[PDB]
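so i finally got all the pieces together for this one. its three components total, 583 residues if u count the protein bits. some of the lines might not be protein, just check the labels. i wanna see the whole assembly predicted at once instead of chain by chain like last time, that was a mess tbh
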Amino acid sequence: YQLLWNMFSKEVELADSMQTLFRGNSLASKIMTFCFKVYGATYLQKLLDPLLRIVITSSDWQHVSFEVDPTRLEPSESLEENQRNLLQMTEKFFHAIISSSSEFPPQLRSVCHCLYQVVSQRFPQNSIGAVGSAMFLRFINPAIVSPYEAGILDKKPPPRIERGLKLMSKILQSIANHVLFTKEEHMRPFNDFVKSNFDAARRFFLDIASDFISDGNVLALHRLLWNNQEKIGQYLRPFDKMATLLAYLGPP
Amino acid sequence: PPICRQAQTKLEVALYMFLWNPDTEAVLVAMSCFRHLCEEADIRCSVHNLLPNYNTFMEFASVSNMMSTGRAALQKRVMALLRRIEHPTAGNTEAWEDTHAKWEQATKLILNDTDSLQEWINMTGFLCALGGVCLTPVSKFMDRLLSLMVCNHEKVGLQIRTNVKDLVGLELSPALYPMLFNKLKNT
Amino acid sequence: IDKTCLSPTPTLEQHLMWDDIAILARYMLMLSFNNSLDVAAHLPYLFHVVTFLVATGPLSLRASTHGLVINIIHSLCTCSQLHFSEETKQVLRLSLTEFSLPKFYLLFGISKVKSAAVIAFRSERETFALTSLETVTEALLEIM
């Protein structure tokens, strides 16, 4: 809690606005993503494995398509039924994500509570939109786009399902960010259904942000500490204690 | 309409091809030019609306107004930020393609005057500066280069070789390394 | 050292019995190995002489003072009559590595020389800083 509190206080004091917060490749964002991975790989695979098994097995025979771009649309396919199938399966897995609040792990719940407190310490209004978006930009939608690469599925899905899951990441990111589609013209028919699920996502985000592992392995922190030893004493008795601990241990 | 977007892409081709110009002031102006493209792409709307070079163009804007010096450090920063872009814009794709097309004619007329060598090494630094992301014409350039640094019998001679062992020696994309290694292996 | 006050000279390398003190300080350096001088009863006298003659004289004696301090702490650690607790032995063990540092090489006046024991047994001076004596006395106070 103190560790994440320190780096996230540094991240929110070094951030310019709320709209650019935790949306880059910073160290705090990488630690956010790794905390998501190590506290929710099991929860996310248990939430998404039967749903992807319903999508791949016993749904995908009858030329089901989610291609909603009229430029890339096949002449044998229909835009309206592609949008209908996409909105149906979107409503299903969005409802599953909202209903998965009780199965959410408590350690990552305390992590998101600390994140909520930190963002509320500088952005007291609508901090939860910064909280939920980070859970969708870095945790749920990368596993949605690449389920085989996330370890959720044993193999890669068919490419029509992959296009549907990339559009799933786009639609759910528009849901979680509380921002409608303004860039792509073919994404605009879903704006009403995204607006109808704004507060449904926000209630789950507020439920998560309110209110247990083994020991460390063989990791040699000596190599990380001593290949960068030259300028850590320069950056400002911690340096003296570090030098004594350096002298007490023989370098390999 | 898509026609103004098409003309905008042709403008991006023009800016990318002026990025290797011998005159330092033209490269400085073309580097400073990108803020207008960024703000117009912002007010037509986030980051996906522009082809994802927006943060690298911010870096272009930041380096554009720092310092004016000799051409060597300017070219070095040009190779740095042209390595750093890491995205396949179609304007960028056209930019390395037509410069590679003029590159063969350029090295042909050099093979069969020091300003010509200056713009020549500028073209090498520009083309090796780009990632040239394939995801093959880039391999054609690579085999040309591996056939080139021997440069066994030529009047200018070593001013090729040494410059080459700097330019591919220092200025090359990190994602371009396996192709170079695999070419060196079977040469 | 008590009787040097009768005919005072400011340097203490200028006083008439400087060679006497240097010669008998070499005795303590030789004899300081394995509690061969009893640190369990002569410790406060011994630190007094240590404080009085840091960074004095030629390079060999300056390194000898440092080696004397190291051997004092080492024999203080390895002495069995004192029967210390574990935490005190731990802080002495850290203090040995503290005095081994190049910072204390600078404090004791041996900056150019890599190893004290090499120059100490082999056989123009930089000025003394009094705050260095303050730091050394604070370290010995903490140990004591």
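Chain A touches chain B at residues 182-183 (CB under 8 Å).
Chain A is about 60% helix and 0% strand.
anyway lmk what u think
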